[PDB]
Coordinates of C-alpha atoms in Angstrom, one line a residue:
Chain A
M1 CA 0.0 -0.1 0.1
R2 CA 1.2 3.6 -1.0
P3 CA 2.8 5.4 1.9
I4 CA 0.6 8.1 3.5
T5 CA 2.0 11.5 4.2
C6 CA -0.8 13.3 6.1
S7 CA -4.6 12.7 6.9
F8 CA -7.0 15.4 7.9
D9 CA -10.8 16.2 8.1
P10 CA -12.0 19.8 7.4
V11 CA -15.2 19.1 9.4
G12 CA -14.0 16.5 11.9
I13 CA -17.3 15.3 13.1
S14 CA -17.6 11.8 11.8
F15 CA -20.7 9.5 12.0
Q16 CA -22.3 5.9 12.1
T17 CA -25.4 5.0 10.2
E18 CA -28.5 3.5 11.7
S19 CA -29.0 0.8 9.4
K20 CA -26.6 -1.8 8.5
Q21 CA -25.3 -1.1 5.1
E22 CA -25.5 -4.9 3.5
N23 CA -24.4 -3.2 0.2
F24 CA -21.2 -1.5 0.9
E25 CA -20.2 -4.3 2.9
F26 CA -17.9 -6.1 0.0
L27 CA -15.6 -3.2 0.7
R28 CA -15.4 -4.6 4.3
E29 CA -15.1 -8.3 3.5
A30 CA -12.4 -7.3 0.9
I31 CA -10.1 -6.5 3.9
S32 CA -9.7 -9.9 5.1
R33 CA -10.8 -12.2 2.0
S34 CA -10.8 -12.2 -1.7
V35 CA -13.8 -10.4 -3.2
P36 CA -14.8 -10.6 -6.8
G37 CA -13.6 -7.5 -8.9
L38 CA -11.0 -6.5 -6.0
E39 CA -8.6 -8.9 -6.9
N40 CA -5.9 -6.4 -7.7
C41 CA -6.6 -4.0 -4.8
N42 CA -5.2 -3.7 -1.2
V43 CA -8.4 -3.1 1.0
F44 CA -8.1 -1.3 4.1
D45 CA -10.1 0.5 6.9
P46 CA -8.4 4.0 6.9
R47 CA -9.3 4.4 10.7
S48 CA -6.6 1.9 11.6
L49 CA -4.0 3.9 9.4
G50 CA -5.0 7.0 11.7
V51 CA -6.8 8.8 8.8
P52 CA -10.1 10.5 9.8
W53 CA -12.9 8.5 8.0
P54 CA -16.1 10.1 8.1
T55 CA -18.1 8.0 5.9
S56 CA -20.6 5.3 5.8
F57 CA -18.2 3.5 3.3
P58 CA -16.5 1.0 5.6
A59 CA -13.3 0.5 3.7
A60 CA -11.3 2.1 0.8
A61 CA -9.6 -0.1 -2.0
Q62 CA -6.1 0.8 -3.7
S63 CA -4.6 -0.6 -6.6
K64 CA -1.5 -3.0 -5.7
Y65 CA 0.5 -1.9 -8.7
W66 CA 1.0 1.5 -7.6
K67 CA 4.5 1.0 -7.7
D68 CA 4.2 0.5 -11.5
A69 CA 2.1 3.5 -11.8
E70 CA 5.0 5.7 -10.2
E71 CA 7.5 4.5 -12.7
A72 CA 5.0 4.9 -15.7
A73 CA 4.4 8.7 -14.6
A74 CA 7.9 9.1 -14.0
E75 CA 8.8 7.7 -17.6
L76 CA 5.8 10.1 -19.1
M77 CA 7.3 13.1 -17.1
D78 CA 10.9 12.5 -18.4
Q79 CA 9.8 12.5 -22.2
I80 CA 7.8 15.8 -21.6
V81 CA 10.7 17.7 -20.0
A82 CA 12.9 16.9 -22.8
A83 CA 10.3 17.8 -25.6
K84 CA 11.9 25.0 -6.4
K85 CA 11.1 24.1 -10.0
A86 CA 11.9 20.4 -8.8
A87 CA 9.0 21.0 -6.1
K88 CA 6.2 20.9 -8.7
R89 CA 7.4 17.8 -10.4
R90 CA 7.5 15.8 -6.9
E91 CA 3.7 16.9 -6.3
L92 CA 2.7 16.3 -9.9
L93 CA 3.9 12.8 -9.9
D94 CA 2.7 11.9 -6.4
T95 CA -0.8 13.6 -7.2
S96 CA -0.7 11.6 -10.7
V97 CA -0.3 8.4 -9.0
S98 CA -2.7 8.6 -5.7
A99 CA -5.7 9.8 -7.5
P100 CA -6.2 7.0 -9.9
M101 CA -4.9 4.2 -7.5
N102 CA -7.4 5.2 -4.9
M103 CA -10.3 6.3 -7.3
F104 CA -9.8 3.4 -9.8
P105 CA -8.1 0.3 -7.6
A106 CA -9.2 -2.4 -9.6
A107 CA -6.3 -1.5 -12.1
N108 CA -3.8 -4.3 -13.0
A109 CA -0.1 -3.4 -13.5
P110 CA -0.5 -2.5 -17.3
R111 CA -3.9 -0.7 -16.7
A112 CA -2.4 1.2 -13.8
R113 CA 0.6 2.7 -15.8
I114 CA -1.9 3.8 -18.4
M115 CA -4.2 5.3 -15.7
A116 CA -1.1 7.2 -14.2
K117 CA 0.1 8.4 -17.2
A118 CA -3.5 9.7 -18.0
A119 CA -3.5 11.4 -14.7
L120 CA 0.0 13.2 -15.2
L121 CA -1.6 14.6 -18.8
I122 CA -4.8 16.0 -17.0
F123 CA -3.1 17.3 -13.9
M124 CA -0.5 18.9 -16.1
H125 CA -3.1 20.7 -18.1
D126 CA -5.1 21.5 -15.1
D127 CA -2.2 23.3 -13.6
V128 CA -1.4 25.0 -16.6
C129 CA -5.1 26.6 -16.8
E130 CA -4.7 27.8 -13.3
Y131 CA -1.9 30.3 -14.3
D132 CA 8.3 20.8 -31.6
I133 CA 4.5 20.5 -31.6
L134 CA 4.8 17.4 -33.9
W135 CA 6.9 16.2 -31.2
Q136 CA 4.5 16.7 -28.3
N137 CA 1.7 15.5 -30.4
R138 CA 3.9 12.2 -31.1
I139 CA 4.5 11.9 -27.3
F140 CA 0.6 11.6 -26.9
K141 CA 0.2 9.3 -30.1
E142 CA 2.4 6.9 -28.6
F143 CA 0.6 6.9 -25.4
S144 CA -2.6 6.5 -27.5
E145 CA -1.0 3.5 -29.1
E146 CA -0.2 2.0 -25.5
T147 CA -3.7 2.3 -24.5
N148 CA -5.5 1.0 -27.6
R149 CA -3.3 -2.0 -27.4
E150 CA -3.9 -2.8 -23.8
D151 CA -7.5 -2.3 -24.2
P152 CA -8.7 -2.2 -28.0
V153 CA -12.5 -1.9 -27.0
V154 CA -12.4 0.8 -24.1
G155 CA -9.3 2.6 -25.3
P156 CA -10.7 5.0 -27.9
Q157 CA -13.5 6.2 -25.4
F158 CA -10.8 6.3 -22.4
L159 CA -8.4 8.9 -24.7
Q160 CA -11.6 10.4 -26.2
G161 CA -12.6 11.3 -22.6
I162 CA -9.4 13.0 -22.0
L163 CA -9.7 15.2 -25.1
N164 CA -13.7 16.0 -24.2
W165 CA -12.1 17.3 -20.5
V166 CA -9.7 19.4 -22.8
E167 CA -12.5 21.1 -24.5
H168 CA -14.8 22.0 -21.4
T169 CA -11.9 23.3 -19.6
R170 CA -11.5 25.9 -22.3
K171 CA -15.2 27.1 -21.6
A172 CA -15.0 30.3 -19.6
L173 CA -17.9 30.5 -16.7
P174 CA -18.5 34.1 -15.9
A175 CA -17.3 35.7 -12.7
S176 CA -20.6 37.4 -12.6
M177 CA -22.3 33.9 -12.1
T178 CA -24.4 33.5 -8.9
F179 CA -26.4 30.4 -7.9
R180 CA -30.2 30.6 -6.8
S181 CA -30.7 27.1 -5.5
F182 CA -28.1 24.6 -4.1
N183 CA -29.4 21.9 -6.6
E184 CA -28.8 24.7 -9.2
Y185 CA -25.3 24.8 -8.2
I186 CA -25.1 20.8 -8.2
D187 CA -25.9 20.9 -12.0
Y188 CA -23.3 23.2 -12.5
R189 CA -20.6 21.6 -10.3
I190 CA -21.5 18.1 -11.8
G191 CA -20.4 19.7 -15.3
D192 CA -16.6 20.0 -14.2
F193 CA -16.9 16.2 -13.4
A194 CA -14.9 15.1 -16.4
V195 CA -17.5 12.1 -16.4
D196 CA -16.5 10.7 -19.8
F197 CA -12.8 10.0 -19.0
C198 CA -13.9 8.6 -15.3
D199 CA -16.7 6.3 -16.5
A200 CA -14.2 5.0 -19.3
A201 CA -11.6 4.6 -16.5
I202 CA -14.0 2.3 -14.6
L203 CA -14.5 0.4 -17.9
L204 CA -10.8 0.0 -18.2
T205 CA -9.8 -0.8 -14.8
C206 CA -12.7 -3.2 -14.1
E207 CA -11.7 -4.8 -17.6
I208 CA -15.5 -4.7 -18.7
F209 CA -17.3 -3.1 -21.4
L210 CA -20.6 -1.2 -21.5
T211 CA -22.5 0.1 -24.5
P212 CA -24.0 3.7 -23.5
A213 CA -27.5 2.0 -23.9
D214 CA -26.3 -0.4 -20.9
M215 CA -25.7 2.5 -18.7
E216 CA -29.2 4.0 -19.0
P217 CA -30.4 2.1 -16.0
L218 CA -27.6 3.2 -14.0
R219 CA -28.4 6.9 -14.7
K220 CA -29.7 7.7 -11.1
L221 CA -27.0 5.9 -9.4
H222 CA -24.6 7.8 -11.7
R223 CA -25.8 11.2 -11.0
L224 CA -25.4 10.5 -7.0
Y225 CA -21.9 9.2 -7.7
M226 CA -20.8 12.4 -9.7
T227 CA -22.6 14.4 -6.9
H228 CA -20.8 12.7 -4.2
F229 CA -17.5 13.0 -5.8
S230 CA -17.9 16.8 -6.9
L231 CA -19.2 17.7 -3.4
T232 CA -16.5 15.6 -1.6
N233 CA -13.8 17.4 -3.6
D234 CA -15.2 21.0 -2.8
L235 CA -15.3 19.9 0.9
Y236 CA -11.8 19.0 1.1
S237 CA -10.6 21.6 -1.4
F238 CA -12.1 24.6 0.4
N239 CA -9.5 25.7 2.4
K240 CA -6.8 25.5 -0.4
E241 CA -8.9 27.5 -2.5
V242 CA -9.3 30.4 0.2
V243 CA -5.6 30.5 0.5
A244 CA -5.4 31.0 -3.3
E245 CA -8.1 33.1 -3.1
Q246 CA -6.5 35.9 -0.8
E247 CA -3.2 35.4 -2.7
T248 CA -4.1 35.5 -6.4
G249 CA -7.5 37.0 -6.0
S250 CA -8.9 33.6 -7.4
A251 CA -12.6 32.9 -7.0
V252 CA -14.1 30.1 -4.9
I253 CA -16.9 28.2 -6.7
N254 CA -16.8 25.9 -3.8
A255 CA -20.2 24.6 -2.5
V256 CA -19.0 25.5 1.1
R257 CA -19.2 29.3 -0.1
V258 CA -22.8 28.5 -1.9
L259 CA -23.9 26.9 1.1
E260 CA -22.8 29.7 3.4
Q261 CA -24.6 32.3 1.2
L262 CA -27.9 30.3 0.6
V263 CA -28.4 29.2 4.0
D264 CA -26.7 32.4 5.6
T265 CA -24.6 30.5 8.2
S266 CA -20.8 30.8 9.3
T267 CA -18.3 29.0 7.1
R268 CA -17.8 26.4 9.6
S269 CA -21.5 25.5 9.8
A270 CA -21.6 25.5 6.0
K271 CA -18.6 22.7 5.9
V272 CA -20.7 20.6 8.4
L273 CA -23.6 21.1 6.4
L274 CA -21.9 20.0 3.2
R275 CA -20.5 17.1 5.2
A276 CA -24.0 16.1 6.4
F277 CA -25.1 16.4 2.7
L278 CA -22.7 14.1 1.8
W279 CA -23.8 11.4 4.4
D280 CA -27.3 11.6 3.0
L281 CA -25.9 11.2 -0.4
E282 CA -24.1 8.1 0.7
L283 CA -27.6 7.0 1.9
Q284 CA -29.2 7.5 -1.4
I285 CA -26.3 5.6 -3.1
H286 CA -26.9 2.5 -0.9
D287 CA -30.7 2.6 -1.4
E288 CA -30.3 3.0 -5.0
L289 CA -27.8 0.1 -5.2
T290 CA -30.4 -2.0 -3.4
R291 CA -33.2 -0.8 -5.8
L292 CA -30.8 -1.8 -8.9
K293 CA -30.3 -5.3 -7.2
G294 CA -33.9 -5.9 -7.6
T295 CA -33.9 -5.2 -11.1
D296 CA -32.5 -7.7 -13.6
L297 CA -28.8 -6.3 -14.1
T298 CA -26.3 -7.6 -16.1
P299 CA -22.9 -8.9 -14.3
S300 CA -20.9 -6.1 -16.0
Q301 CA -23.6 -3.5 -15.4
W302 CA -23.5 -4.5 -11.8
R303 CA -19.6 -4.4 -11.7
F304 CA -19.8 -0.9 -13.0
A305 CA -22.4 0.1 -10.6
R306 CA -19.9 -1.1 -7.7
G307 CA -17.0 0.6 -9.5
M308 CA -18.7 4.0 -9.0
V309 CA -18.9 3.1 -5.1
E310 CA -15.3 2.5 -5.4
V311 CA -14.5 5.9 -6.9
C312 CA -16.5 7.6 -4.3
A313 CA -14.6 5.9 -1.4
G314 CA -11.1 6.1 -3.2
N315 CA -11.8 10.1 -3.8
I316 CA -12.7 10.5 0.1
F317 CA -9.3 8.6 1.1
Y318 CA -7.2 10.3 -1.6
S319 CA -8.6 13.7 -0.6
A320 CA -8.0 13.2 3.1
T321 CA -4.3 12.1 2.3
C322 CA -3.8 15.1 -0.1
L323 CA -1.3 17.7 1.1
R324 CA -2.7 20.2 -1.2
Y325 CA -5.8 20.3 0.5
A326 CA -4.1 19.1 4.2
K327 CA -2.1 22.0 5.7
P328 CA -1.5 24.2 2.5
Chain B
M1 CA 4.3 39.4 -55.5
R2 CA 6.3 38.5 -52.2
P3 CA 9.2 41.0 -51.8
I4 CA 12.7 39.5 -52.4
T5 CA 15.4 39.6 -49.6
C6 CA 18.3 38.4 -51.9
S7 CA 19.2 36.6 -55.0
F8 CA 22.6 34.5 -55.9
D9 CA 23.4 31.6 -58.0
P10 CA 26.2 29.3 -56.3
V11 CA 27.6 28.5 -59.9
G12 CA 27.1 31.2 -62.3
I13 CA 26.7 29.6 -65.6
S14 CA 23.5 30.3 -67.8
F15 CA 21.5 27.8 -69.7
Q16 CA 21.5 28.0 -73.5
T17 CA 18.9 26.3 -75.4
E18 CA 19.6 24.1 -78.7
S19 CA 15.9 23.0 -78.5
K20 CA 12.4 24.6 -78.2
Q21 CA 11.3 23.3 -75.0
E22 CA 7.8 23.3 -76.2
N23 CA 6.5 21.3 -73.1
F24 CA 7.8 23.8 -70.8
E25 CA 6.5 26.8 -72.4
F26 CA 3.1 27.0 -70.7
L27 CA 5.2 28.8 -68.2
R28 CA 5.9 31.5 -70.7
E29 CA 2.3 31.5 -71.8
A30 CA 1.5 32.4 -68.1
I31 CA 3.5 35.4 -67.9
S32 CA 1.4 37.1 -70.6
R33 CA -1.9 35.2 -70.7
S34 CA -4.1 33.3 -68.3
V35 CA -2.9 29.3 -68.5
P36 CA -5.2 27.0 -67.1
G37 CA -4.2 25.7 -63.8
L38 CA -2.0 28.6 -63.0
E39 CA -5.2 30.9 -62.3
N40 CA -4.1 31.2 -58.6
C41 CA -0.4 32.2 -59.3
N42 CA 1.6 35.2 -60.5
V43 CA 3.9 33.6 -63.2
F44 CA 6.9 35.8 -64.0
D45 CA 10.7 35.5 -64.6
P46 CA 13.2 35.4 -62.1
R47 CA 15.9 37.3 -64.1
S48 CA 13.6 40.3 -64.7
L49 CA 13.7 40.9 -60.8
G50 CA 17.4 40.6 -61.0
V51 CA 17.1 37.0 -59.7
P52 CA 19.8 34.7 -61.2
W53 CA 17.8 32.0 -63.2
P54 CA 20.3 29.2 -64.4
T55 CA 17.7 26.9 -65.5
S56 CA 15.7 25.7 -68.7
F57 CA 12.4 26.4 -67.0
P58 CA 11.2 29.6 -69.0
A59 CA 9.2 30.9 -65.7
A60 CA 8.6 30.5 -62.2
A61 CA 5.0 30.7 -60.6
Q62 CA 4.2 31.8 -57.0
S63 CA 0.7 31.9 -55.3
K64 CA -0.9 35.1 -55.3
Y65 CA -2.3 34.3 -51.9
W66 CA 1.1 34.6 -50.0
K67 CA -0.2 37.6 -47.8
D68 CA -2.8 35.1 -46.7
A69 CA 0.0 32.5 -45.9
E70 CA 1.7 35.1 -44.1
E71 CA -1.1 35.9 -41.8
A72 CA -2.0 32.2 -41.0
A73 CA 1.8 31.3 -40.4
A74 CA 1.8 34.1 -37.9
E75 CA -1.3 33.2 -36.1
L76 CA 0.2 29.6 -35.6
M77 CA 3.5 30.8 -34.2
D78 CA 1.8 32.7 -31.6
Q79 CA -0.3 29.8 -30.3
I80 CA 2.7 27.7 -30.2
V81 CA 4.9 30.1 -28.3
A82 CA 2.1 30.5 -26.0
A83 CA 1.8 26.7 -25.0
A84 CA 5.3 26.1 -23.7
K85 CA 17.4 35.1 -30.3
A86 CA 14.2 36.0 -31.7
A87 CA 16.0 36.0 -35.0
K88 CA 14.8 32.2 -35.5
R89 CA 11.3 33.0 -35.4
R90 CA 11.3 35.6 -38.2
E91 CA 13.6 33.3 -40.3
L92 CA 11.2 30.4 -39.5
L93 CA 8.2 32.5 -40.4
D94 CA 9.8 33.7 -43.6
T95 CA 10.7 30.1 -44.9
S96 CA 7.5 28.9 -44.0
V97 CA 6.0 31.3 -46.3
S98 CA 8.5 31.3 -49.0
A99 CA 8.7 27.6 -49.7
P100 CA 5.1 26.6 -49.9
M101 CA 4.0 29.4 -52.0
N102 CA 6.9 29.0 -54.6
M103 CA 6.9 25.2 -54.5
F104 CA 3.1 24.9 -54.8
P105 CA 1.7 28.0 -56.5
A106 CA -1.6 27.0 -57.3
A107 CA -2.9 27.5 -53.9
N108 CA -6.0 29.7 -53.3
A109 CA -6.1 31.9 -50.0
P110 CA -7.6 29.0 -47.7
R111 CA -5.1 26.3 -49.4
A112 CA -2.3 28.7 -49.1
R113 CA -3.3 29.0 -45.4
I114 CA -3.2 25.5 -44.7
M115 CA 0.3 25.0 -46.6
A116 CA 1.9 28.0 -44.7
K117 CA 0.6 26.1 -41.2
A118 CA 1.9 22.8 -42.6
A119 CA 5.3 24.4 -43.6
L120 CA 5.8 26.0 -40.3
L121 CA 5.2 22.7 -38.3
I122 CA 7.7 20.9 -40.7
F123 CA 10.2 23.7 -40.5
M124 CA 10.1 23.8 -36.6
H125 CA 10.4 20.2 -36.3
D126 CA 13.5 20.3 -38.6
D127 CA 15.3 23.1 -37.0
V128 CA 14.7 21.2 -33.6
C129 CA 16.4 18.1 -34.9
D130 CA 0.8 21.4 -21.4
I131 CA 1.2 18.3 -23.8
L132 CA -2.7 18.0 -24.5
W133 CA -2.8 21.9 -25.2
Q134 CA -0.2 21.4 -28.0
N135 CA -2.1 18.4 -29.1
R136 CA -5.0 20.3 -29.5
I137 CA -3.3 22.7 -31.8
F138 CA -2.5 20.3 -34.1
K139 CA -6.0 18.8 -33.8
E140 CA -7.6 22.1 -35.2
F141 CA -4.9 22.0 -37.9
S142 CA -6.1 18.8 -39.1
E143 CA -9.8 19.5 -38.7
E144 CA -9.1 22.8 -40.6
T145 CA -7.4 21.0 -43.4
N146 CA -9.9 18.0 -43.5
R147 CA -12.7 20.5 -43.7
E148 CA -11.3 22.4 -46.8
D149 CA -10.4 18.9 -48.7
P150 CA -12.0 16.0 -47.1
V151 CA -10.5 13.5 -49.9
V152 CA -6.9 14.8 -50.0
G153 CA -6.4 16.3 -46.5
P154 CA -6.0 12.8 -44.6
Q155 CA -3.0 11.9 -46.7
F156 CA -1.7 15.7 -46.5
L157 CA -1.7 15.3 -42.5
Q158 CA -0.6 11.5 -42.9
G159 CA 2.2 12.7 -45.1
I160 CA 3.6 15.1 -42.3
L161 CA 3.5 12.6 -39.8
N162 CA 5.4 10.1 -42.2
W163 CA 8.1 12.7 -42.3
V164 CA 8.6 13.0 -38.6
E165 CA 9.1 9.2 -38.4
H166 CA 11.6 8.9 -41.0
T167 CA 14.4 11.4 -39.3
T168 CA 31.7 9.0 -48.1
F169 CA 29.7 7.7 -51.3
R170 CA 31.1 5.3 -53.9
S171 CA 28.3 5.6 -56.5
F172 CA 26.8 8.9 -57.6
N173 CA 23.7 6.6 -58.6
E174 CA 23.9 5.3 -55.1
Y175 CA 23.8 9.0 -53.4
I176 CA 21.0 9.7 -55.8
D177 CA 18.8 6.6 -54.5
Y178 CA 19.6 7.9 -50.8
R179 CA 18.7 11.5 -51.7
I180 CA 15.3 10.3 -53.5
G181 CA 14.6 8.7 -49.9
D182 CA 15.1 11.7 -47.7
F183 CA 12.4 13.2 -49.7
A184 CA 9.1 14.0 -48.0
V185 CA 7.2 12.2 -50.7
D186 CA 3.9 11.5 -49.2
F187 CA 3.5 15.3 -48.0
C188 CA 4.8 16.7 -51.3
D189 CA 2.6 14.5 -53.6
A190 CA -0.5 15.5 -51.4
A191 CA 0.4 19.1 -51.5
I192 CA 0.2 19.2 -55.1
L193 CA -3.2 17.4 -54.9
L194 CA -4.4 19.9 -52.4
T195 CA -3.1 23.0 -54.2
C196 CA -4.3 21.7 -57.6
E197 CA -7.7 21.0 -56.2
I198 CA -7.5 17.2 -57.7
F199 CA -7.2 14.0 -56.4
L200 CA -5.2 10.9 -57.8
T201 CA -5.5 7.5 -56.3
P202 CA -2.1 5.6 -56.2
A203 CA -3.1 3.7 -59.4
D204 CA -3.8 6.9 -60.9
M205 CA -0.1 7.7 -60.1
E206 CA 1.1 4.6 -61.9
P207 CA 1.9 6.5 -65.2
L208 CA 3.8 9.6 -63.8
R209 CA 6.1 7.8 -61.6
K210 CA 9.1 7.8 -64.0
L211 CA 8.4 11.8 -64.2
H212 CA 7.8 11.9 -60.2
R213 CA 11.4 10.2 -59.7
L214 CA 12.9 12.9 -62.3
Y215 CA 11.2 15.6 -60.2
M216 CA 12.3 14.1 -56.9
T217 CA 16.1 13.9 -58.3
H218 CA 15.7 17.7 -59.5
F219 CA 14.5 18.7 -56.3
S220 CA 16.8 17.0 -54.2
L221 CA 20.0 17.9 -56.4
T222 CA 18.8 21.5 -56.6
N223 CA 18.5 21.8 -52.8
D224 CA 21.7 20.3 -52.5
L225 CA 23.6 22.7 -55.0
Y226 CA 22.3 25.8 -53.3
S227 CA 22.5 24.5 -49.6
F228 CA 26.3 23.5 -50.3
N229 CA 27.9 26.8 -49.4
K230 CA 26.1 26.7 -46.0
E231 CA 27.1 23.2 -45.3
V232 CA 30.8 23.8 -46.1
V233 CA 30.5 27.3 -44.2
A234 CA 29.2 25.2 -41.2
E235 CA 31.9 22.6 -41.5
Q236 CA 34.5 25.1 -41.4
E237 CA 32.5 26.9 -38.3
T238 CA 31.6 23.8 -36.3
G239 CA 33.3 21.0 -38.1
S240 CA 29.8 19.9 -39.1
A241 CA 29.5 17.0 -42.0
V242 CA 29.0 17.8 -45.3
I243 CA 26.3 15.3 -47.4
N244 CA 26.2 17.0 -50.8
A245 CA 26.2 15.9 -54.3
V246 CA 28.8 18.6 -55.0
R247 CA 31.3 16.7 -52.4
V248 CA 30.1 13.4 -53.5
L249 CA 31.1 14.6 -57.3
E250 CA 34.4 16.3 -56.3
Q251 CA 35.4 13.0 -54.8
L252 CA 34.4 10.6 -57.4
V253 CA 35.8 12.6 -60.2
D254 CA 38.8 13.9 -57.9
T255 CA 38.1 17.7 -59.0
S256 CA 38.0 21.2 -58.0
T257 CA 34.8 22.7 -56.1
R258 CA 33.8 24.7 -58.9
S259 CA 34.2 22.1 -61.4
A260 CA 31.9 20.1 -59.1
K261 CA 29.3 23.0 -58.9
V262 CA 29.5 23.3 -62.7
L263 CA 29.0 19.4 -63.1
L264 CA 26.1 19.3 -61.0
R265 CA 24.5 22.3 -62.5
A266 CA 24.9 20.7 -66.1
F267 CA 23.4 17.3 -64.6
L268 CA 20.5 19.6 -63.2
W269 CA 20.0 20.7 -66.7
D270 CA 20.1 17.4 -68.3
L271 CA 17.5 16.4 -65.7
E272 CA 15.3 19.3 -66.8
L273 CA 15.6 17.9 -70.5
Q274 CA 14.7 14.5 -69.4
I275 CA 11.6 15.9 -67.6
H276 CA 10.6 17.8 -70.8
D277 CA 11.3 14.5 -73.1
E278 CA 8.9 12.6 -70.6
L279 CA 6.2 15.0 -70.9
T280 CA 6.3 14.6 -74.8
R281 CA 6.0 10.9 -74.3
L282 CA 3.3 11.1 -71.8
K283 CA 1.2 13.4 -74.1
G284 CA 0.8 10.7 -76.6
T285 CA -0.3 8.3 -73.7
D286 CA -3.9 8.5 -72.5
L287 CA -3.9 10.7 -69.5
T288 CA -7.0 11.9 -67.3
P289 CA -7.3 15.8 -66.9
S290 CA -6.0 15.8 -63.4
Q291 CA -3.5 13.2 -64.0
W292 CA -2.0 15.8 -66.3
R293 CA -2.8 18.4 -64.0
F294 CA -0.4 16.5 -61.4
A295 CA 2.5 16.3 -64.1
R296 CA 2.4 19.9 -64.5
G297 CA 2.6 20.5 -60.9
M298 CA 5.8 18.6 -60.5
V299 CA 7.4 20.8 -62.8
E300 CA 6.0 23.9 -60.9
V301 CA 7.4 22.4 -57.7
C302 CA 10.8 21.9 -59.6
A303 CA 10.9 25.5 -61.0
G304 CA 9.6 26.8 -57.6
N305 CA 12.1 25.3 -55.6
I306 CA 15.1 26.8 -57.8
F307 CA 13.3 30.2 -57.2
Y308 CA 12.8 29.5 -53.4
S309 CA 16.4 28.3 -53.2
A310 CA 18.0 31.4 -55.1
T311 CA 15.7 33.6 -52.9
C312 CA 16.5 32.1 -49.8
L313 CA 18.8 34.2 -47.3
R314 CA 20.1 31.0 -45.5
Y315 CA 21.2 29.1 -48.7
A316 CA 22.8 32.5 -49.8
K317 CA 26.0 33.2 -48.0
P318 CA 25.0 34.6 -44.5

């Protein structure tokens, strides 16, 4: 399991649910015994590692091939830098590995390398926005070839999911924007999801394939998963944004700020409200999983459903373990 | 017509004709009257603008939309230097416009635009010899190209990429076969197709291949003669290697440098005669209108290459 530098909780409340989550239990069982779908993961309870774990999810899953992912990201990094300042590289590679290993833990060694390379590309572009060509184009084309030869079915959507993200990040969103309802912000915040890549990443790491029509029954669960992911990211990232907001005059589009204004409460209470919102979202995920279990669902369809749960849990762990959010 | 920076001839001897050269004369025709295929170019005589013109080709053609190509190349450069001394960029912009406008003169305003951007990409790569951002620039260029010409354009972009991948002599014919090889053939053939607004399948190309090889030889050897002085000056300056037909011939014939330069110039004139002879032979053969348009385009690339080489400041002594 990848060493953890830090652990923190913005709200530091934590809770226990009144009902036993028979669903989500596969994560707990995976700590001690082999569970279907998690054969490529180390599954643990973050509380044993001293990480604050304010979630109904009993465990977190991490790909056991993170060391291969570190090498691949390091490899890609060297290609780019050929085509203080060392500080960003240490963080970029660390973040490029920690995110996919936790968010998409079912990755075997080769698919972990692809995921780590994909994360580095996404993260390098994200950092640039928050601030020869044929040669660079050749680097990505090689990355595309390695991906398409690993997974020919999902590979194109995987790479297309990356490119779709680049298109959306261009889109300016006015500083004059104000949100009247919290749902209204949710519909907006869900948009910064990069779902097409994330959905393809689940397909890739779980080594399954779903047509878009196969995804239609999972629409409700899919929206809950995007909501939990985005809102979780806002909660843990809020303090880091406030630091950046005072320094560079950067805006905060965080749900904390939205909640503070809409409900007219203190910042600390808004964070508590956001954490509580997430706890109910986790319950809604659990109910939807139960409802879906009643319906006739394909094994691959159910594996995708469970993968979304693994993204949410891994996102919480990643965010709690992330230094950029923790003590900025 | 694009302003001229310099004009030079490495050798200095002029061509004299014992033969009419009727198949070339469409180049004459185009100076005074409209010639089919040359509606998008200004056709002129380099000698009149004081440019040494040591060729049997009577005229050279340059696209009338070079100012648009000047614009497009400038835009692309700005995007590139935004994604992450100054003399190189100005030189790169110059050659990126001068070469394709002369080599591929039939280009209209949009097609001149594609060529200048394509030339800039190639030339910046040769000089060298956030990732997702740079990739997006090439992506828009590909879509911009395919959207002008959906049939020729995928080959035109594939020819660029094929060029990117591909990066003492005992026999001169052996040296020629090598230099033919270092020829960005895929791109150049596609650029002729694009600028001439015609398409030829590979089977359509079967008849013109002997001329195509003559054209490749004339292009390579012409570039070698003009480049030579820069290669030799570099060799004294930085001990850099000289791979040039001039040096090869000087070695094989064991002769002086001007004799080698004169020898190659005469060889080039004989290639132009062979080009002219093949044109007549093909005229008897059954050729499609654009099949014939491709043949004339290759001559236009050859003539334009001489003009470009004579007009290039780098090829001229610094």
